[PDB]
Amino acid sequence: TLNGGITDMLTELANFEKNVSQAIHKYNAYRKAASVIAKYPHKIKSGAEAKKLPGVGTKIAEKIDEFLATGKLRKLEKIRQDDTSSSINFLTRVSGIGPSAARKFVDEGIKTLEDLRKNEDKLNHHQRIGLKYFGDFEKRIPREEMLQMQDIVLNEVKKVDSEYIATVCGSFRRGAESSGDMDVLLTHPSFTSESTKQPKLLHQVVEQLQKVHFITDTLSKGETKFMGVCQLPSKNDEKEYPHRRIDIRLIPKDQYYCGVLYFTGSDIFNKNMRAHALEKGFTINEYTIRPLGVTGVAGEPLPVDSEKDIFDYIQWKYREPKDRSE
DNA sequence: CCGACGGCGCATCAGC
DNA sequence: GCTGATGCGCC
DNA sequence: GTCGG
Ligand SMILES: [Cl-]
Ligand SMILES: [Cl-]
Ligand SMILES: [Mg+2]
Ligand SMILES: [Mg+2]
Ligand code: NA
Ligand code: NA
């Protein structure tokens, strides 16, 4: 991590803009810059050197010069001292509490973990579970544990219907040694872009994982996306494992490649790739890649038989999952 | 200079 | 009840 | 905040 001090600064600025300022484009700008700097293979010597990178402009260059010179950023020193900003930044660390809710809570005098813990009745379902597992959700998952979780999910899904295919995506599929959570892409031949021949496809699977005490809580649930909590079983006399976040996304089987591209990420990689697509005259989502017609309206879905096909359309050399950790 | 910035699932709520 | 906006979440 | 037209 050659430029860890700089990327940390930019990430903190991004979080400020997202959580406090509520300026989503500034948030995205800062994260793009941190990402491009993170992959830069030299220790950065000045703002000008950084400004050569795409996504780093005049203002970030200036902040880099201050940070190189002094080891800190005055702007951030002040933000750190601001009680309201500090409170809002903290509250948003609870899953289900965003920029808006955090500011509203602070207005009501709810601004610490203790405050939250005595005001559960002021939380919606999602927020109440986020609070319940506040500490657990901040811990990362060792790949060894991700492997254990993979085995449970794949084996239980098979028990439900041998025709399901479950694929673990996210940072796991990018080969990370630790993951923030578990992301599972699910397919079944009864659910395609052309028909849904079986109901409760996602439900059946969730139910089974709850039955074996793997899924412990639900944050939200619809026909195609589950967002919840899970936990590895522990042995006799063993401390319990932390509770972990799990997302399950059922994708039309014939749209698996666009699905797995999306769910493999990273998020910044997806943003960069989708933006490049738009520049090349295509639009990409988790289902399809379509051309943009002269007007500006998406056209019909193009044939895709591999992840690589998607890269080809937009004239990118193929990038293995492990090289998409932007 | 200024329009655009990725795309979409689920929960909540206002207006009808 | 529905629909459209908004908040918050996924990558 | 940065980029491209
Ligand atoms: Cl700092
Ligand atoms: Cl589509
Ligand atoms: Mg993940
Ligand atoms: Mg996730
Ligand atoms: Na630049
Ligand atoms: Na949050």
Side-chain angles (χ1 to χ4, degrees), chain A residues 285 287-288 290:
Chain A
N285 60 24
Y287 301 123
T288 60
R290 302 173 277 167

Side-chain angles (χ1 to χ4, degrees), chain A residues 202-246:
Chain A
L202 184 47
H203 185 85
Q204 285 185 333
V205 164
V206 167
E207 174 152 353
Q208 174 72 17
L209 289 174
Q210 288 171 327
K211 169 195 150 202
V212 295
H213 304 100
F214 188 63
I215 289 185
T216 55
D217 307 85
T218 297
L219 302 172
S220 72
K221 183 174 171 297
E223 292 294 321
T224 62
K225 181 170 128 285
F226 173 84
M227 180 167 299
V229 182
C230 61
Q231 175 183 42
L232 282 180
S234 52
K235 297 186 175 188
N236 287 343
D237 276 17
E238 279 191 18
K239 189 191 221 302
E240 293 197 351
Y241 284 94
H243 289 72
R244 310 298 200 178
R245 277 273 292 109
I246 180 164

Side-chain angles (χ1 to χ4, degrees), chain A residues 171 173-176 264-265 319-326:
Chain A
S171 59
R173 184 170 188 261
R174 306 199 307 272
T264 294
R319 290 169 59 185
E320 299 294 335
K322 65 167 163 48
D323 298 314
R324 300 174 199 171
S325 293
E326 322 212 304

Side-chain angles (χ1 to χ4, degrees), chain A residues 180-183 245-247 263:
Chain A
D181 71 5
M182 170 168 282
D183 307 294
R245 277 273 292 109
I246 180 164
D247 298 313
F263 224 18

